[PDB]
Amino acid sequence: TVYLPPVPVSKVVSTDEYVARTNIYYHAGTSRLLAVGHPYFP
Amino acid sequence: ATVYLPPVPVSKVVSTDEYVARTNIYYHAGTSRLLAVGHPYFPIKKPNNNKILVPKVSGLQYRVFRIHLPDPNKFGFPDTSFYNPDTQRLVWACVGVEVGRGQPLGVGISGHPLLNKLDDTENASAYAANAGVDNRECISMDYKQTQLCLIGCKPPIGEHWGKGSPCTNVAVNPGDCPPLELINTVIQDGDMVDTGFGAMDFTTLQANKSEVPLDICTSICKYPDYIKMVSEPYGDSLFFYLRREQMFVRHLFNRAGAVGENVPDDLYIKGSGSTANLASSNYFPTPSGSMVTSDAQIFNKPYWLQRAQGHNNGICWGNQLFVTVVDTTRSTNMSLCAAISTSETTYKNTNFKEYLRHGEEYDLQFIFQLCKITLTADVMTYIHSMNSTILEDWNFGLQPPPGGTLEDTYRFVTSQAIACQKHTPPAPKEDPLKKYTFWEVNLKEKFSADLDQFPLGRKFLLQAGLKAKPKF
Amino acid sequence: PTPSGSMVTSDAQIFNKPYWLQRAQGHNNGICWGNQLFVTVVDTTRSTNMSLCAAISTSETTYKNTNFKEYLRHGEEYDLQFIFQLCKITLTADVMT
Amino acid sequence: IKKPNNNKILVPKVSGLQYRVFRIHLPDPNKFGFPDTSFYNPDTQRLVWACVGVEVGRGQPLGVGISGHPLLNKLDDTENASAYAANAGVDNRECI
Amino acid sequence: DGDMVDTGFGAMDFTTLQANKSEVPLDICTSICKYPDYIKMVSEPYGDSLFFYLRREQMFVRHLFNRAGAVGENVPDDLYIKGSGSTANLASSNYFPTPSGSMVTSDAQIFNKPYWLQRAQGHNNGICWGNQLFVTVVDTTRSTN
Amino acid sequence: EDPLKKYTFWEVNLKEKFSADLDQFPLGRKFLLQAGLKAKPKF
């Protein structure tokens, strides 16, 4: 009952509030990734 | 004569959802987090002193959680007008519960440096030798994997075997078999899960002290009795729970020592030579934990509670709420070493002391629902019937002394250096269970009025539906 | 062969869960004649044998296997709760017969 | 367990491996007065109990027992043998 | 990057707290194995740490050993009965298990399958601020040497 | 009376223990819950 009686306006909001979704979509991607190296020590 | 049946005494404990009313309001509070450190096998203390240097901690130790709530009837809200503080009260209802666990998942272990053992009974190419003196060995094993959860407004009731008073006819000689007790008791923190050796006191019934690994040797492993618990009239022990456990066999051994009772010969045929002596008859299995999985984890998942086995529906009387949680999954024991001498470059076992410390990670996030109680004739009775103390922290606002008045408090002005007695101003004690020690947390400061800002709650949203709360 | 029990689980427990009889392979439907009803239950899951030891002499601090007698006792725990429905029978001769 | 000379049992043999039978009497309901008994005629009829549903409570913590014998008829391990076994003696039984 | 998964020895620095340097296999000996705290992470008000994840792991016991060296702290005698001769000396109390990977299956693979994300635990819904997007992926399945 | 009296085995007598209300018992209310129709007095 200590900390509750004051309350001012605060509230992170769900990003979907202000954000708007458009009609367009895209893609991109790497070709591929490849790495080689010894397991135990460099 | 016996059973041909008129009579009807009982007034029938009823489902709490009868008189309780559910409000529109919901709240949350949660701890930041909890973790505990410690040594798994035994507590650390100064050798001469009785004071503990390090507390004994392991996941194998049980965990109790007591949680206080502030009295909601001291609170104030936006719309507090919706009720009358005179004819009514306010009580918290516990809608849903979460158990946070962040440790990376891995298995611990235990053993004992002197373990009563004869030999390996799984395969023997020849009859064993004769029992010497103190054949006990350094051997370890893993405990059964287990997960369980307990929630309610009354402390969890466990049970164990124990030694009671033998009926007095035959005089007990040293080494006789003591008789063996079913005992209920309150569950205390720091107590130990069963190892698959069953809930009892080894200290009393096991004189060898070597029959089990360290961690449990002194303590009393106990086990929750669902039956006795659930069959409470009010269910207020626990209104909900879950359980998971599994085990399988690994090794097969013999107790080593003087045979307490010989097998009747007719159960076998007498041997001779090496076969003249009967090998130790006692076998005990080696319990072995199995592969843990991410899947069977019972934590990190929300649990909604509406209907329960008991008539209590998530009602916390006396601003009080209980959580009992036990898991072996995180039992991992990190080992570390320090160097007493950092100079020499030739490795020497004498240079490194070895230590064992253990992590314990808990988190709590609680939904709560708000509830009011109208007072009427039966109402007060029914509660006063149920438990009267619960009432007492309310106003009632009855009465106070129509149970009775204190006749007077003799208050009599003396420097105490008169010859007149001691008088010490009394009455702190509010806890009947204060004898029982266990883990403590205070939420009282932590409530908030908006679930949006919390990770857990918006699931409350998502499940129930809607946002913010005031949008159809 | 050497038969071997496998890993027990909390899941496959057949107890501590209600049952609901509607149909029975026989024509008898849950009728207990002669006020008489039978239950046969067998399980190995709780077979745990607690071992204990007593000391014939509590004095010496040097342990000796001769000092302790060994005993084996074993727990068992059952519970029963039965619903019952009440039933009447009319008569005629055929039935009586 | 029994007194060694006597035939009377000191302790009864008990293990989970033992079967368990449960016999349950009920009192004859036709003797049992109902809050209203009027819905039937005790002359022309009777009353018999029907068993709708059943439960089995078990409270022990779950764990596996075990058994063996100090003299067990055995020759050798047949899972792996690097050489032919020996010749059978007298009373090779083992504790397993 | 380059940091090490837990081996079942827990997230810490062995270099600092283990002087012996021999208490674990090479790969982790120098580095600090770390582990993600979902709690801490999800406690972000935004979730902008992570708005999504999945996890799978399993382990079982294999062998049981002893640390070899000077006892750091003796066990209180009252926890046992003093031996004699060979039994006069208490063998090393410290045990450590041997973690063991289990059978992999094609099924449990979390990869090579599309994952749609609409609603997330944080108020961030798949929003990438600063033209910036993060992915952290770790697996043991392909570890073949 | 018992023709099987030759057959010894575990015995229990319930005859005293009947009651007319599931509600007071843990198990029963499930019977109610399953078939529904929660009928209880007012308070």
mmCIF file with all atom_site columns, N, CA and C in Angstrom, chain A residues 1-31:
data_model
loop_
_atom_site.group_PDB
_atom_site.id
_atom_site.type_symbol
_atom_site.label_atom_id
_atom_site.label_alt_id
_atom_site.label_comp_id
_atom_site.label_asym_id
_atom_site.label_entity_id
_atom_site.label_seq_id
_atom_site.pdbx_PDB_ins_code
_atom_site.Cartn_x
_atom_site.Cartn_y
_atom_site.Cartn_z
_atom_site.occupancy
_atom_site.B_iso_or_equiv
_atom_site.pdbx_formal_charge
_atom_site.auth_seq_id
_atom_site.auth_comp_id
_atom_site.auth_asym_id
_atom_site.auth_atom_id
_atom_site.pdbx_PDB_model_num
ATOM 1  N N  . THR A 1 1  ? 0.829  -1.196  0.000   1.00 0.00 ? 1  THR A N  1
ATOM 2  C CA . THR A 1 1  ? 0.000  0.000   0.000   1.00 0.00 ? 1  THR A CA 1
ATOM 3  C C  . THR A 1 1  ? 0.867  1.250   0.000   1.00 0.00 ? 1  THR A C  1
ATOM 4  N N  . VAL A 1 2  ? 2.154  1.063   0.285   1.00 0.00 ? 2  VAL A N  1
ATOM 5  C CA . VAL A 1 2  ? 3.128  2.145   0.229   1.00 0.00 ? 2  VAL A CA 1
ATOM 6  C C  . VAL A 1 2  ? 3.205  2.732   -1.172  1.00 0.00 ? 2  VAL A C  1
ATOM 7  N N  . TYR A 1 3  ? 3.651  1.927   -2.133  1.00 0.00 ? 3  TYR A N  1
ATOM 8  C CA . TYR A 1 3  ? 4.097  2.432   -3.425  1.00 0.00 ? 3  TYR A CA 1
ATOM 9  C C  . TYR A 1 3  ? 2.994  2.574   -4.454  1.00 0.00 ? 3  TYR A C  1
ATOM 10 N N  . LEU A 1 4  ? 1.835  2.008   -4.215  1.00 0.00 ? 4  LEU A N  1
ATOM 11 C CA . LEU A 1 4  ? 0.769  2.116   -5.195  1.00 0.00 ? 4  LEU A CA 1
ATOM 12 C C  . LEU A 1 4  ? 0.003  3.429   -5.341  1.00 0.00 ? 4  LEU A C  1
ATOM 13 N N  . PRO A 1 5  ? -0.329 4.167   -4.264  1.00 0.00 ? 5  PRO A N  1
ATOM 14 C CA . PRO A 1 5  ? -1.316 5.250   -4.441  1.00 0.00 ? 5  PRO A CA 1
ATOM 15 C C  . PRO A 1 5  ? -0.905 6.265   -5.499  1.00 0.00 ? 5  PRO A C  1
ATOM 16 N N  . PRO A 1 6  ? 0.336  6.758   -5.533  1.00 0.00 ? 6  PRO A N  1
ATOM 17 C CA . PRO A 1 6  ? 0.707  7.564   -6.697  1.00 0.00 ? 6  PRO A CA 1
ATOM 18 C C  . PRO A 1 6  ? 0.879  6.660   -7.889  1.00 0.00 ? 6  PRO A C  1
ATOM 19 N N  . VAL A 1 7  ? 0.537  7.223   -9.024  1.00 0.00 ? 7  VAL A N  1
ATOM 20 C CA . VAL A 1 7  ? 0.623  6.540   -10.301 1.00 0.00 ? 7  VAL A CA 1
ATOM 21 C C  . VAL A 1 7  ? 0.571  7.693   -11.268 1.00 0.00 ? 7  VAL A C  1
ATOM 22 N N  . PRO A 1 8  ? 1.553  7.834   -11.991 1.00 0.00 ? 8  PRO A N  1
ATOM 23 C CA . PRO A 1 8  ? 1.497  8.739   -13.120 1.00 0.00 ? 8  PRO A CA 1
ATOM 24 C C  . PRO A 1 8  ? 1.598  7.969   -14.447 1.00 0.00 ? 8  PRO A C  1
ATOM 25 N N  . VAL A 1 9  ? 1.490  8.642   -15.590 1.00 0.00 ? 9  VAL A N  1
ATOM 26 C CA . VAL A 1 9  ? 1.271  7.982   -16.883 1.00 0.00 ? 9  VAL A CA 1
ATOM 27 C C  . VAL A 1 9  ? 2.605  7.472   -17.394 1.00 0.00 ? 9  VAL A C  1
ATOM 28 N N  . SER A 1 10 ? 2.720  6.160   -17.665 1.00 0.00 ? 10 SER A N  1
ATOM 29 C CA . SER A 1 10 ? 4.067  5.624   -17.860 1.00 0.00 ? 10 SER A CA 1
ATOM 30 C C  . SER A 1 10 ? 4.345  4.643   -19.026 1.00 0.00 ? 10 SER A C  1
ATOM 31 N N  . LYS A 1 11 ? 4.119  3.337   -18.857 1.00 0.00 ? 11 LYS A N  1
ATOM 32 C CA . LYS A 1 11 ? 3.743  2.472   -19.977 1.00 0.00 ? 11 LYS A CA 1
ATOM 33 C C  . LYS A 1 11 ? 4.557  2.424   -21.271 1.00 0.00 ? 11 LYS A C  1
ATOM 34 N N  . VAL A 1 12 ? 5.613  1.608   -21.350 1.00 0.00 ? 12 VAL A N  1
ATOM 35 C CA . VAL A 1 12 ? 6.026  1.144   -22.673 1.00 0.00 ? 12 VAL A CA 1
ATOM 36 C C  . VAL A 1 12 ? 4.797  0.623   -23.396 1.00 0.00 ? 12 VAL A C  1
ATOM 37 N N  . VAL A 1 13 ? 4.738  0.839   -24.701 1.00 0.00 ? 13 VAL A N  1
ATOM 38 C CA . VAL A 1 13 ? 3.596  0.389   -25.477 1.00 0.00 ? 13 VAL A CA 1
ATOM 39 C C  . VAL A 1 13 ? 4.062  -0.648  -26.479 1.00 0.00 ? 13 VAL A C  1
ATOM 40 N N  . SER A 1 14 ? 3.107  -1.419  -26.977 1.00 0.00 ? 14 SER A N  1
ATOM 41 C CA . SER A 1 14 ? 3.411  -2.409  -27.997 1.00 0.00 ? 14 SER A CA 1
ATOM 42 C C  . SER A 1 14 ? 3.768  -1.710  -29.298 1.00 0.00 ? 14 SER A C  1
ATOM 43 N N  . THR A 1 15 ? 4.936  -2.039  -29.847 1.00 0.00 ? 15 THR A N  1
ATOM 44 C CA . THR A 1 15 ? 5.409  -1.350  -31.040 1.00 0.00 ? 15 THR A CA 1
ATOM 45 C C  . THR A 1 15 ? 4.376  -1.367  -32.147 1.00 0.00 ? 15 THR A C  1
ATOM 46 N N  . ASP A 1 16 ? 3.536  -2.397  -32.181 1.00 0.00 ? 16 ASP A N  1
ATOM 47 C CA . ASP A 1 16 ? 2.487  -2.445  -33.180 1.00 0.00 ? 16 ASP A CA 1
ATOM 48 C C  . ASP A 1 16 ? 1.529  -1.279  -33.075 1.00 0.00 ? 16 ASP A C  1
ATOM 49 N N  . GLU A 1 17 ? 1.549  -0.543  -31.973 1.00 0.00 ? 17 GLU A N  1
ATOM 50 C CA . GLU A 1 17 ? 0.730  0.653   -31.882 1.00 0.00 ? 17 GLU A CA 1
ATOM 51 C C  . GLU A 1 17 ? 1.087  1.659   -32.964 1.00 0.00 ? 17 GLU A C  1
ATOM 52 N N  . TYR A 1 18 ? 2.264  2.264   -32.856 1.00 0.00 ? 18 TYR A N  1
ATOM 53 C CA . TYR A 1 18 ? 2.591  3.349   -33.766 1.00 0.00 ? 18 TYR A CA 1
ATOM 54 C C  . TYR A 1 18 ? 3.083  2.848   -35.112 1.00 0.00 ? 18 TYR A C  1
ATOM 55 N N  . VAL A 1 19 ? 3.797  1.723   -35.143 1.00 0.00 ? 19 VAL A N  1
ATOM 56 C CA . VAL A 1 19 ? 4.283  1.203   -36.411 1.00 0.00 ? 19 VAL A CA 1
ATOM 57 C C  . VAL A 1 19 ? 3.109  0.902   -37.332 1.00 0.00 ? 19 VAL A C  1
ATOM 58 N N  . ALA A 1 20 ? 3.333  1.050   -38.630 1.00 0.00 ? 20 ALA A N  1
ATOM 59 C CA . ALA A 1 20 ? 2.371  0.639   -39.634 1.00 0.00 ? 20 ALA A CA 1
ATOM 60 C C  . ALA A 1 20 ? 3.023  -0.358  -40.577 1.00 0.00 ? 20 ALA A C  1
ATOM 61 N N  . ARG A 1 21 ? 2.281  -1.403  -40.924 1.00 0.00 ? 21 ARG A N  1
ATOM 62 C CA . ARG A 1 21 ? 2.752  -2.407  -41.863 1.00 0.00 ? 21 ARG A CA 1
ATOM 63 C C  . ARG A 1 21 ? 2.356  -2.020  -43.279 1.00 0.00 ? 21 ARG A C  1
ATOM 64 N N  . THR A 1 22 ? 3.275  -2.210  -44.210 1.00 0.00 ? 22 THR A N  1
ATOM 65 C CA . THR A 1 22 ? 3.076  -1.826  -45.594 1.00 0.00 ? 22 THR A CA 1
ATOM 66 C C  . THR A 1 22 ? 2.628  -3.026  -46.416 1.00 0.00 ? 22 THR A C  1
ATOM 67 N N  . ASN A 1 23 ? 2.554  -2.844  -47.727 1.00 0.00 ? 23 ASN A N  1
ATOM 68 C CA . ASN A 1 23 ? 2.170  -3.927  -48.614 1.00 0.00 ? 23 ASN A CA 1
ATOM 69 C C  . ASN A 1 23 ? 3.353  -4.675  -49.213 1.00 0.00 ? 23 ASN A C  1
ATOM 70 N N  . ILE A 1 24 ? 4.565  -4.197  -49.037 1.00 0.00 ? 24 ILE A N  1
ATOM 71 C CA . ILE A 1 24 ? 5.700  -4.700  -49.799 1.00 0.00 ? 24 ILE A CA 1
ATOM 72 C C  . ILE A 1 24 ? 6.539  -5.637  -48.946 1.00 0.00 ? 24 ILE A C  1
ATOM 73 N N  . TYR A 1 25 ? 7.115  -6.642  -49.594 1.00 0.00 ? 25 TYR A N  1
ATOM 74 C CA . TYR A 1 25 ? 8.059  -7.549  -48.971 1.00 0.00 ? 25 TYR A CA 1
ATOM 75 C C  . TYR A 1 25 ? 9.273  -7.700  -49.866 1.00 0.00 ? 25 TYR A C  1
ATOM 76 N N  . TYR A 1 26 ? 10.410 -8.038  -49.264 1.00 0.00 ? 26 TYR A N  1
ATOM 77 C CA . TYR A 1 26 ? 11.624 -8.320  -50.016 1.00 0.00 ? 26 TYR A CA 1
ATOM 78 C C  . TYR A 1 26 ? 12.337 -9.515  -49.422 1.00 0.00 ? 26 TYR A C  1
ATOM 79 N N  . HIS A 1 27 ? 13.339 -9.981  -50.159 1.00 0.00 ? 27 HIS A N  1
ATOM 80 C CA . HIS A 1 27 ? 14.267 -10.960 -49.636 1.00 0.00 ? 27 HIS A CA 1
ATOM 81 C C  . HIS A 1 27 ? 15.684 -10.626 -50.056 1.00 0.00 ? 27 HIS A C  1
ATOM 82 N N  . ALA A 1 28 ? 16.620 -11.097 -49.245 1.00 0.00 ? 28 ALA A N  1
ATOM 83 C CA . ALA A 1 28 ? 18.024 -11.178 -49.596 1.00 0.00 ? 28 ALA A CA 1
ATOM 84 C C  . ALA A 1 28 ? 18.635 -12.282 -48.755 1.00 0.00 ? 28 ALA A C  1
ATOM 85 N N  . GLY A 1 29 ? 19.759 -12.805 -49.225 1.00 0.00 ? 29 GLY A N  1
ATOM 86 C CA . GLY A 1 29 ? 20.469 -13.810 -48.464 1.00 0.00 ? 29 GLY A CA 1
ATOM 87 C C  . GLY A 1 29 ? 21.907 -13.927 -48.908 1.00 0.00 ? 29 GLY A C  1
ATOM 88 N N  . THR A 1 30 ? 22.733 -14.413 -47.994 1.00 0.00 ? 30 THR A N  1
ATOM 89 C CA . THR A 1 30 ? 24.094 -14.761 -48.346 1.00 0.00 ? 30 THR A CA 1
ATOM 90 C C  . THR A 1 30 ? 24.091 -15.922 -49.314 1.00 0.00 ? 30 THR A C  1
ATOM 91 N N  . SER A 1 31 ? 25.166 -16.031 -50.077 1.00 0.00 ? 31 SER A N  1
ATOM 92 C CA . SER A 1 31 ? 25.361 -17.260 -50.823 1.00 0.00 ? 31 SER A CA 1
ATOM 93 C C  . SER A 1 31 ? 25.431 -18.423 -49.851 1.00 0.00 ? 31 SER A C  1
#
